[PDB]
Amino acid sequence: GIGDILKNLAKAAGKAALHAVGESL
């Protein structure tokens, strides 16, 4: 479903953002 995909993308984006922050150190 389109809605399901959108929700998944949002969650995936958050995890990716966090990983970048850690690697920043």
JSON list of N, CA, C and O in Angstrom, two decimals:
[
{"chain": "A", "resi": 1, "resn": "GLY", "atom": "N", "xyz": [0.86, -1.22, 0.00]},
{"chain": "A", "resi": 1, "resn": "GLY", "atom": "CA", "xyz": [0.00, 0.00, 0.00]},
{"chain": "A", "resi": 1, "resn": "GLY", "atom": "C", "xyz": [0.88, 1.24, 0.00]},
{"chain": "A", "resi": 1, "resn": "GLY", "atom": "O", "xyz": [1.98, 1.24, 0.55]},
{"chain": "A", "resi": 2, "resn": "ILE", "atom": "N", "xyz": [0.39, 2.31, -0.62]},
{"chain": "A", "resi": 2, "resn": "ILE", "atom": "CA", "xyz": [1.14, 3.56, -0.69]},
{"chain": "A", "resi": 2, "resn": "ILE", "atom": "C", "xyz": [1.37, 4.12, 0.71]},
{"chain": "A", "resi": 2, "resn": "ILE", "atom": "O", "xyz": [2.46, 4.58, 1.04]},
{"chain": "A", "resi": 3, "resn": "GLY", "atom": "N", "xyz": [0.32, 4.10, 1.54]},
{"chain": "A", "resi": 3, "resn": "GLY", "atom": "CA", "xyz": [0.42, 4.61, 2.89]},
{"chain": "A", "resi": 3, "resn": "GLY", "atom": "C", "xyz": [1.47, 3.85, 3.70]},
{"chain": "A", "resi": 3, "resn": "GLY", "atom": "O", "xyz": [2.26, 4.45, 4.43]},
{"chain": "A", "resi": 4, "resn": "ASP", "atom": "N", "xyz": [1.48, 2.54, 3.55]},
{"chain": "A", "resi": 4, "resn": "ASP", "atom": "CA", "xyz": [2.43, 1.70, 4.27]},
{"chain": "A", "resi": 4, "resn": "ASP", "atom": "C", "xyz": [3.86, 2.03, 3.86]},
{"chain": "A", "resi": 4, "resn": "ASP", "atom": "O", "xyz": [4.76, 2.12, 4.70]},
{"chain": "A", "resi": 5, "resn": "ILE", "atom": "N", "xyz": [4.07, 2.22, 2.56]},
{"chain": "A", "resi": 5, "resn": "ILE", "atom": "CA", "xyz": [5.39, 2.54, 2.05]},
{"chain": "A", "resi": 5, "resn": "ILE", "atom": "C", "xyz": [5.87, 3.88, 2.59]},
{"chain": "A", "resi": 5, "resn": "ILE", "atom": "O", "xyz": [7.03, 4.03, 2.98]},
{"chain": "A", "resi": 6, "resn": "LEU", "atom": "N", "xyz": [4.97, 4.86, 2.61]},
{"chain": "A", "resi": 6, "resn": "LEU", "atom": "CA", "xyz": [5.32, 6.19, 3.10]},
{"chain": "A", "resi": 6, "resn": "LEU", "atom": "C", "xyz": [5.76, 6.13, 4.56]},
{"chain": "A", "resi": 6, "resn": "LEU", "atom": "O", "xyz": [6.75, 6.75, 4.95]},
{"chain": "A", "resi": 7, "resn": "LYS", "atom": "N", "xyz": [5.02, 5.37, 5.36]},
{"chain": "A", "resi": 7, "resn": "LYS", "atom": "CA", "xyz": [5.33, 5.23, 6.77]},
{"chain": "A", "resi": 7, "resn": "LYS", "atom": "C", "xyz": [6.69, 4.56, 6.95]},
{"chain": "A", "resi": 7, "resn": "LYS", "atom": "O", "xyz": [7.48, 4.96, 7.80]},
{"chain": "A", "resi": 8, "resn": "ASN", "atom": "N", "xyz": [6.95, 3.54, 6.14]},
{"chain": "A", "resi": 8, "resn": "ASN", "atom": "CA", "xyz": [8.21, 2.82, 6.21]},
{"chain": "A", "resi": 8, "resn": "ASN", "atom": "C", "xyz": [9.37, 3.75, 5.86]},
{"chain": "A", "resi": 8, "resn": "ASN", "atom": "O", "xyz": [10.42, 3.70, 6.48]},
{"chain": "A", "resi": 9, "resn": "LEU", "atom": "N", "xyz": [9.16, 4.58, 4.85]},
{"chain": "A", "resi": 9, "resn": "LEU", "atom": "CA", "xyz": [10.20, 5.51, 4.42]},
{"chain": "A", "resi": 9, "resn": "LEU", "atom": "C", "xyz": [10.55, 6.47, 5.56]},
{"chain": "A", "resi": 9, "resn": "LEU", "atom": "O", "xyz": [11.72, 6.73, 5.84]},
{"chain": "A", "resi": 10, "resn": "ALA", "atom": "N", "xyz": [9.52, 6.99, 6.21]},
{"chain": "A", "resi": 10, "resn": "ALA", "atom": "CA", "xyz": [9.73, 7.92, 7.32]},
{"chain": "A", "resi": 10, "resn": "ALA", "atom": "C", "xyz": [10.57, 7.27, 8.42]},
{"chain": "A", "resi": 10, "resn": "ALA", "atom": "O", "xyz": [11.53, 7.87, 8.92]},
{"chain": "A", "resi": 11, "resn": "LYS", "atom": "N", "xyz": [10.22, 6.05, 8.78]},
{"chain": "A", "resi": 11, "resn": "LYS", "atom": "CA", "xyz": [10.95, 5.33, 9.82]},
{"chain": "A", "resi": 11, "resn": "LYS", "atom": "C", "xyz": [12.39, 5.06, 9.39]},
{"chain": "A", "resi": 11, "resn": "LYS", "atom": "O", "xyz": [13.33, 5.21, 10.18]},
{"chain": "A", "resi": 12, "resn": "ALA", "atom": "N", "xyz": [12.56, 4.67, 8.13]},
{"chain": "A", "resi": 12, "resn": "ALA", "atom": "CA", "xyz": [13.89, 4.38, 7.60]},
{"chain": "A", "resi": 12, "resn": "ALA", "atom": "C", "xyz": [14.75, 5.64, 7.58]},
{"chain": "A", "resi": 12, "resn": "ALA", "atom": "O", "xyz": [15.95, 5.59, 7.84]},
{"chain": "A", "resi": 13, "resn": "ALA", "atom": "N", "xyz": [14.13, 6.77, 7.26]},
{"chain": "A", "resi": 13, "resn": "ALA", "atom": "CA", "xyz": [14.85, 8.04, 7.20]},
{"chain": "A", "resi": 13, "resn": "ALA", "atom": "C", "xyz": [15.39, 8.42, 8.58]},
{"chain": "A", "resi": 13, "resn": "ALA", "atom": "O", "xyz": [16.50, 8.93, 8.70]},
{"chain": "A", "resi": 14, "resn": "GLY", "atom": "N", "xyz": [14.60, 8.16, 9.61]},
{"chain": "A", "resi": 14, "resn": "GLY", "atom": "CA", "xyz": [15.01, 8.48, 10.97]},
{"chain": "A", "resi": 14, "resn": "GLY", "atom": "C", "xyz": [16.22, 7.66, 11.39]},
{"chain": "A", "resi": 14, "resn": "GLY", "atom": "O", "xyz": [17.17, 8.19, 11.97]},
{"chain": "A", "resi": 15, "resn": "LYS", "atom": "N", "xyz": [16.19, 6.36, 11.10]},
{"chain": "A", "resi": 15, "resn": "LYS", "atom": "CA", "xyz": [17.30, 5.49, 11.46]},
{"chain": "A", "resi": 15, "resn": "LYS", "atom": "C", "xyz": [18.57, 5.92, 10.72]},
{"chain": "A", "resi": 15, "resn": "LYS", "atom": "O", "xyz": [19.65, 5.97, 11.30]},
{"chain": "A", "resi": 16, "resn": "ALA", "atom": "N", "xyz": [18.42, 6.24, 9.43]},
{"chain": "A", "resi": 16, "resn": "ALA", "atom": "CA", "xyz": [19.56, 6.67, 8.63]},
{"chain": "A", "resi": 16, "resn": "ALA", "atom": "C", "xyz": [20.15, 7.96, 9.19]},
{"chain": "A", "resi": 16, "resn": "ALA", "atom": "O", "xyz": [21.37, 8.12, 9.24]},
{"chain": "A", "resi": 17, "resn": "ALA", "atom": "N", "xyz": [19.28, 8.87, 9.61]},
{"chain": "A", "resi": 17, "resn": "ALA", "atom": "CA", "xyz": [19.74, 10.14, 10.17]},
{"chain": "A", "resi": 17, "resn": "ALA", "atom": "C", "xyz": [20.55, 9.91, 11.44]},
{"chain": "A", "resi": 17, "resn": "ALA", "atom": "O", "xyz": [21.57, 10.56, 11.66]},
{"chain": "A", "resi": 18, "resn": "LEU", "atom": "N", "xyz": [20.09, 8.99, 12.27]},
{"chain": "A", "resi": 18, "resn": "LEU", "atom": "CA", "xyz": [20.78, 8.70, 13.52]},
{"chain": "A", "resi": 18, "resn": "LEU", "atom": "C", "xyz": [22.17, 8.12, 13.26]},
{"chain": "A", "resi": 18, "resn": "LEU", "atom": "O", "xyz": [23.14, 8.47, 13.93]},
{"chain": "A", "resi": 19, "resn": "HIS", "atom": "N", "xyz": [22.25, 7.22, 12.28]},
{"chain": "A", "resi": 19, "resn": "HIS", "atom": "CA", "xyz": [23.53, 6.59, 11.95]},
{"chain": "A", "resi": 19, "resn": "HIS", "atom": "C", "xyz": [24.54, 7.65, 11.52]},
{"chain": "A", "resi": 19, "resn": "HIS", "atom": "O", "xyz": [25.71, 7.58, 11.89]},
{"chain": "A", "resi": 20, "resn": "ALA", "atom": "N", "xyz": [24.09, 8.61, 10.73]},
{"chain": "A", "resi": 20, "resn": "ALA", "atom": "CA", "xyz": [24.97, 9.68, 10.26]},
{"chain": "A", "resi": 20, "resn": "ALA", "atom": "C", "xyz": [25.52, 10.49, 11.43]},
{"chain": "A", "resi": 20, "resn": "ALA", "atom": "O", "xyz": [26.69, 10.88, 11.44]},
{"chain": "A", "resi": 21, "resn": "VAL", "atom": "N", "xyz": [24.67, 10.74, 12.42]},
{"chain": "A", "resi": 21, "resn": "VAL", "atom": "CA", "xyz": [25.07, 11.51, 13.59]},
{"chain": "A", "resi": 21, "resn": "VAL", "atom": "C", "xyz": [26.19, 10.79, 14.33]},
{"chain": "A", "resi": 21, "resn": "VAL", "atom": "O", "xyz": [27.18, 11.40, 14.74]},
{"chain": "A", "resi": 22, "resn": "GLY", "atom": "N", "xyz": [26.03, 9.48, 14.51]},
{"chain": "A", "resi": 22, "resn": "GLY", "atom": "CA", "xyz": [27.04, 8.69, 15.22]},
{"chain": "A", "resi": 22, "resn": "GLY", "atom": "C", "xyz": [28.37, 8.69, 14.47]},
{"chain": "A", "resi": 22, "resn": "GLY", "atom": "O", "xyz": [29.42, 8.89, 15.06]},
{"chain": "A", "resi": 23, "resn": "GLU", "atom": "N", "xyz": [28.30, 8.47, 13.15]},
{"chain": "A", "resi": 23, "resn": "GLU", "atom": "CA", "xyz": [29.51, 8.44, 12.34]},
{"chain": "A", "resi": 23, "resn": "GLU", "atom": "C", "xyz": [30.20, 9.80, 12.35]},
{"chain": "A", "resi": 23, "resn": "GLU", "atom": "O", "xyz": [31.40, 9.90, 12.08]},
{"chain": "A", "resi": 24, "resn": "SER", "atom": "N", "xyz": [29.44, 10.85, 12.66]},
{"chain": "A", "resi": 24, "resn": "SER", "atom": "CA", "xyz": [30.00, 12.19, 12.71]},
{"chain": "A", "resi": 24, "resn": "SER", "atom": "C", "xyz": [31.12, 12.27, 13.75]},
{"chain": "A", "resi": 24, "resn": "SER", "atom": "O", "xyz": [32.13, 12.95, 13.53]},
{"chain": "A", "resi": 25, "resn": "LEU", "atom": "N", "xyz": [30.94, 11.59, 14.87]},
{"chain": "A", "resi": 25, "resn": "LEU", "atom": "CA", "xyz": [31.93, 11.59, 15.92]},
{"chain": "A", "resi": 25, "resn": "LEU", "atom": "C", "xyz": [33.30, 11.19, 15.38]},
{"chain": "A", "resi": 25, "resn": "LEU", "atom": "O", "xyz": [34.14, 12.05, 15.12]}
]
